[PDB]
Amino acid sequence: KGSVVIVGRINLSGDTAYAQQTRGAAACQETSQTGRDKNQVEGEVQIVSTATQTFLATSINGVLWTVYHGAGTRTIASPKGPVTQMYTNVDKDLVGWQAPQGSRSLTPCTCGSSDLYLVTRHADVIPVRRRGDSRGSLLSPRPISYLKGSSGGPLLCPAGHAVGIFRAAVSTRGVAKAVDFIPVESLETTMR
Ligand SMILES: C=C[C@@H]1C[C@]1(NC(=O)[C@@H]1C[C@@H](Oc2ncc(OC)c3ccc(Cl)cc23)CN1C(=O)[C@@H](NC(=O)OC(C)(C)C)C(C)(C)C)C(=O)NS(=O)(=O)C1CC1
Ligand SMILES: [Cl-]
Ligand SMILES: [Zn+2]
What we know:
Its main location: host cell. It is found in: Host cell; Host membrane; Virion membrane. Zn(2+) binds at residues 109, 111, 157. The protein is mainly β. It folds into 2 domains: 1-106, Beta Barrel (Thrombin, subunit H), CATH 2.40.10.120; 107-192, Trypsin-like serine proteases (Thrombin, subunit H, Beta Barrel). It is built from 4 helices and 13 strands. The protein is globular. The chain binds ligand 2R9, chloride ion and zinc ion (ZN).
């Protein structure tokens, strides 16, 4: 069992969101096994990988957060070797490590906005209407396949603050009409 490896990143700053791949699937074996990753981290959102699966991780308040169902209890690879998890909550599906040096963190939202935006692993930014503490509705339904690999990514408010971490798709016969997320307030409670 190896470390989670950063294989890309998503930029949310400036005027244009974009994805950049920094490491190929072939291969992350050495980095996985050793937990030593030479690459200097950038950006707010990391594209991360285990042996055969990819997902996202988001820096908020100096902690790099992701989903347990992706990371498990794994360390994350870094230039100084494997980094042990700071936070682990299986009930919430939540993992956090100390944010990598050179990372930019998002600020938790206190706007109270109903209009949210989900950032996918391809750096698509899709509108979500908030509908409860941990739920939002997609304005356009999407096959679940479209959202697979985007867990751990941010839901943002219009000003680009973090509102939550994408956890699960609300699936009706293989089609997502809504998304379930870990709200930033819940991240705060975990940090208590
Ligand atoms: C389609 C894209 C969705 C965003 C995505 N997440 C999913 O697949 C999640 C995983 C799983 O949920 C949970 N696991 C473990 C938990 O704890 C450890 C949970 C604790 C609390 C809650 Cl809430 C959920 C938990 C089931 N699930 C669904 O989304 C499921 N939906 C779901 O369960 O919906 C309800 C929550 C509303 C029931 C289903 C599979 C049916 C869509 C993804 O992309 N993953 S991934 O590919 O990146 C993978 C990391 C590599
Ligand atoms: Cl890397
Ligand atoms: Zn806000």
